[PDB]
Amino acid sequence: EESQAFQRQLTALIGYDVTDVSNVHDDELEFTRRGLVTPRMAEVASRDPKLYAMHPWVTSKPLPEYLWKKIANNCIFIVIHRSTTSQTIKVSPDDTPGAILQSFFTKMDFVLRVCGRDEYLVGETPIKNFQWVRHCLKNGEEIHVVLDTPPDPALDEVRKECDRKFRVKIRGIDIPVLDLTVFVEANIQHGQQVLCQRRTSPKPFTEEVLWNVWLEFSIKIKDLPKGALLNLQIYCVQLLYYVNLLLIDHRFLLRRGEYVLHMWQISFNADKLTSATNPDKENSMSISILLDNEMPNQLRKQLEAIIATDPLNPLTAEDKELLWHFRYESLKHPKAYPKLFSSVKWGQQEIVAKTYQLLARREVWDQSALDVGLTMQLLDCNFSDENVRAIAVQKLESLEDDDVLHYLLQLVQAVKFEPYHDSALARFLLKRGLRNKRIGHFLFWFLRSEIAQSRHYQQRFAVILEAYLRGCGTAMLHDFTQQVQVIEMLQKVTLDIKSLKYDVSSQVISQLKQKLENLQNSQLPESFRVPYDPGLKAGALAIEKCKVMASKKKPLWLEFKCADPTALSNETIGIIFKHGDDLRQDMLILQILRIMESIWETESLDLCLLPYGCISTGDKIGMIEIVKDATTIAKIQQSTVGNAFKDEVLNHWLKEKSPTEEKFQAAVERFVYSCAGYCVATFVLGIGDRHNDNIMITETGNLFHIDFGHIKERVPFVLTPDFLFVMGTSKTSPHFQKFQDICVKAYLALRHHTNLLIILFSMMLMTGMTSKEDIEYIRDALTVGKNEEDAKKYFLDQIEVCRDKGWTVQFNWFLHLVL
Numbered sequence: 001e002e003s004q005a006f007q008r009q010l011t012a013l014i015g016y017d018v019t020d021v022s023n024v025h026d027d028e029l030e031f032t033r034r035g036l037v038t039p040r041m042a043e044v045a046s047r048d049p050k051l052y053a054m055h056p057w058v059t060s061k062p063l064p065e066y067l068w069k070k071i072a073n074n075c076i077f078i079v080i081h082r083s084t085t086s087q088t089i090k091v092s093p094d095d096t097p098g099a100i101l102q103s104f105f106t107k108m109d110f111v112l113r114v115c116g117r118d119e120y121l122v123g124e125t126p127i128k129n130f131q132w133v134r135h136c137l138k139n140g141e142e143i144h145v146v147l148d149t150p151p152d153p154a155l156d157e158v159r160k161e162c163d164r165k166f167r168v169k170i171r172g173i174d175i176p177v178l179d180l181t182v183f184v185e186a187n188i189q190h191g192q193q194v195l196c197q198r199r200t201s202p203k204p205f206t207e208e209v210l211w212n213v214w215l216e217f218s219i220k221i222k223d224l225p226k227g228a229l230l231n232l233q234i235y236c237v238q239l240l241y242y243v244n245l246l247l248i249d250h251r252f253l254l255r256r257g258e259y260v261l262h263m264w265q266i267s268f269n270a271d272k273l274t275s276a277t278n279p280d281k282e283n284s285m286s287i288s289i290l291l292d293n294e295m296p297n298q299l300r301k302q303l304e305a306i307i308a309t310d311p312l313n314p315l316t317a318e319d320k321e322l323l324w325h326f327r328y329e330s331l332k333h334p335k336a337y338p339k340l341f342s343s344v345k346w347g348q349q350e351i352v353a354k355t356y357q358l359l360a361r362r363e364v365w366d367q368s369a370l371d372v373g374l375t376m377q378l379l380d381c382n383f384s385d386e387n388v389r390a391i392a393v394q395k396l397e398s399l400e401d402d403d404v405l406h407y408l409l410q411l412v413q414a415v416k417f418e419p420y421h422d423s424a425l426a427r428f429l430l431k432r433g434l435r436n437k438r439i440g441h442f443l444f445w446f447l448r449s450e451i452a453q454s455r456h457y458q459q460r461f462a463v464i465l466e467a468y469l470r471g472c473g474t475a476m477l478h479d480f481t482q483q484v485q486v487i488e489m490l491q492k493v494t495l496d497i498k499s500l501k502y503d504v505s506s507q508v509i510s511q512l513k514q515k516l517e518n519l520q521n522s523q524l525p526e527s528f529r530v531p532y533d534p535g536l537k538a539g540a541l542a543i544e545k546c547k548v549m550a551s552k553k554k555p556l557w558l559e560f561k562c563a564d565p566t567a568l569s570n571e572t573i574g575i576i577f578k579h580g581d582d583l584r585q586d587m588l589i590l591q592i593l594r595i596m597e598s599i600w601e602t603e604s605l606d607l608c609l610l611p612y613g614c615i616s617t618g619d620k621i622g623m624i625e626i627v628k629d630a631t632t633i634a635k636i637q638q639s640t641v642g643n644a645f646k647d648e649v650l651n652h653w654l655k656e657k658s659p660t661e662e663k664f665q666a667a668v669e670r671f672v673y674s675c676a677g678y679c680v681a682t683f684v685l686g687i688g689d690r691h692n693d694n695i696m697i698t699e700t701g702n703l704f705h706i707d708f709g710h711i712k713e714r715v716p717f718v719l720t721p722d723f724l725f726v727m728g729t730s731k732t733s734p735h736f737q738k739f740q741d742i743c744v745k746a747y748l749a750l751r752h753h754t755n756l757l758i759i760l761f762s763m764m765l766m767t768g769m770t771s772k773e774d775i776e777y778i779r780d781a782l783t784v785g786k787n788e789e790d791a792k793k794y795f796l797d798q799i800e801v802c803r804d805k806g807w808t809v810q811f812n813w814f815l816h817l818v819l
């Protein structure tokens with residue numbers, strides 16, 4: 001009774017009813033729901049109540065060289081607040097919050113919480129290892145902390161509880177509303193690799209097409225591997241409809257009986273591997289089927305060259321036969337594992353057996369230091385083997401919480417490549433999310449994003465999210481309810497306003513202010529956590545400061561009062577609500593940008609990127625962080641010029657925005673670093689040729705790219721004469737020499753992680769955006785196979801292309817966006 005009311009709560013939180021069984025041909029999902037109860041109960045039981053409640057955000061990574069330079073006399077200052085009194089305490093970087101709290105007991109148990117944020121400085125960790133402390137030192141900000149009560153862990157309450165050949169009969173296909181011919185193609189797939197293919201006779205394409213044909217395959221029943229798919233496709237030759245059926249179910253049983261599968265239409269892609277059937281029964285095409293059944297010196301040199309190549313380089317049959325024959329020598333190299341597991345003939349019982357016998361000897365793999373890039377390779381579309389994939393998830397177990405946040409989005413997307421709903425990787429995301437509130441918060445949104453707009457993976461993700469939500473605790477369930485109610489309310493307003501020329505009229509601005517006033521006094525909760533920044537609690541809408549922006553898509557500019565009084569400022573929380581752009585694509589790029597920032601940190605570099613907050617909430621809709629004191633490069637050009645570009649404008653803008661020369665000199669240095677940062681990052685990703693309306697800058701000189709939704713004279717990246725003027729070049733300058741030095745050092749630093757970026761990219765396009773040629777872009781961009789000296793000049797040439805193009809490209813972009 002109250003059990004049923006709790007499920008409706010979950011349904012509203014998830015955005016999908018998990019109990020629904022109208023779109024299933026088996027009990028996989030229900031078996032998975034049941035399956036995940038154990039990992040859920042196991043993690044809820046093993047987590048420390050106190051640390052789970054306070055969620056301390058910490059890193060074990062060494063403090064970078066640039067932050068060591070910002071700390072004088074091995075002393076950090078912390079301002080400790082309480083009601084009206086605040087004192088500054090000299091703290092050593094190695095001091096534990098427990099020891100610092102004893103100093104505010106002798107110098108005249110409570111907890112140290114960051115001012116105006118739900119972020120605590122607790123646990124056996126030196127302050128230098130707290131992310132917020134690192135954040136403050138990075139931006140040159142004073143650490144303000146408040147002395148208050150630790151939150152009650154009671155609030156985190158969890159509610160109690162055979163030699164025959166394989167064959168398939170194709171009965172027929174049928175579409176309600178369609179003189180071309182048509183045929184059905186049947187494939188036995190195991191991780192992209194087609195083991196066996198069979199076709200039907202072409203019949204005239206009508207509203208109902210019957211065959212009653214037994215399609216005998218070459219592959220034997222015994223040779224079928226677990227995780228193999230019966231891919232059914234309809235070609236008219238152009239492909240129109242597809243559907244997948246797992247030949248061996250979640251119970252290790254060979255699939256039998258009658259099946260009526262509603263197929264997916266066509267507009268490679270993770271959506272093409274889905275075991276799910278089309279929920280649209282009334283309009284979709286459906287298919288009716290029936291089932292009822294030691295090594296030489298030279299070869300080592302050749303093998304080592306194979307192992308060394310990038311993850312995209314294809315293996316020839318020659319390469320594969322070499323890798324397999326010398327699998328035991330190959331097993332001694334963890335970097336070889338993806339290529340070795342691609343040399344496996346999975347449609348042969350004896351070979352798979354030998355592969356499993358091989359995996360028993362994982363000495364080198366197990367002992368090796370974790371390589372994320374290598375681990376990620378084994379979780380892509382090329383590996384359907386549960387045991388192969390499990391060895392990767394095993395390596396991920398050793399990632400610290402800080403690192404899980406870096407890879408979380410890609411890891412959630414990587415669930416799409418899993419043959420079965422319950423999987424080691426799904427369980428891993430469940431385990432990590434339940435162990436940490438920050439991981440859990442993002443995990444919620446990431447999964448909620450896919451459920452909202454992916455009919456291909458909503459059922460699988462909805463099972464995982466229900467599993468999370470059933471163990472996250474009342475506290476967080478309350479937080480997610482407040483967030484879901486707010487965003488649902490605001491999405492309605494976003495779409496309503498878009499429905500009402502690029503001119504923002506008086507009648508439109510009034511209608512928005514009218515709707516927001518109506519929500520405020522109605523059912524909008526008093527406060528809510530910011531989905532892209534869970535540390536911040538937003539309160540009431542500042543209607544006066546709210547507006548509709550003069551754009552193509554007409555987004556909402558919303559401003560909130562901070563719910564936390566303990567904030568040392570009366571700053572408002574700015575959020576943009578937008579319909580028209582695919583923000584899942586923006587989310588993926590931003591996640592890659594943060595991975596690049598972490599790669600530069602390893603080499604003690606800070607290229608000052610601004611990977612702003614961005615959450616996808618539904619179909620072509622979501623929210624974006626308003627970056628305070630920032631403007632568009634085009635708006636700076638519009639203020640002096642109008643519609644033509646002047647080089648002196650940018651440097652002039654930074655001068656008038658600077659109070660002192662001391663702050664202006666810092667603004668120039670920040671522009672040099674940030675420009676170099678975006679120049680390298682956008683180039684590698686192939687999203688460099690951009691209009692200056694899509695590039696922003698802060699009043700503090702920080703340059704940043706925005707609007708990554710959907711991406712002749714071309715340019716590697718945007719390096720315009722106005723950017724070069726801030727560096728002091730029309731020639732060369734000590735700033736421009738510093739710029740080229742940063743670029744090369746940054747570009748070469750990313751090339752040291754070629755395999756990682758290639759995998760992240762390969763996966764990003766498969767789950768977020770395309771063709772083989774689109775994926776191979778990054779190989780050329782990262783100059784795979786070239787030496788550092790040769791690669792150093794390559795990027796220096798790319799910079800020289802920008803200088804030789806000038807304003808040409810920018811000007812042509814201006815013409816493009818004005819028809």
Ligand SMILES: Cc1cc2ncnn2cc1Nc1ncc2c(n1)n(C1CCOCC1)c(=O)n2C
Pocket residue numbers: 549551576612624625626627628630631632693696706707708
């Ligand atoms: C960070 C960010 C990324 C992004 N991607 C798409 N929209 N979007 C908005 C963002 N945030 C932001 N913060 C402050 C802004 C601002 N955008 N804009 C405009 C808004 C329309 O597009 C051009 C920029 C301003 O005039 N100010 C003062």
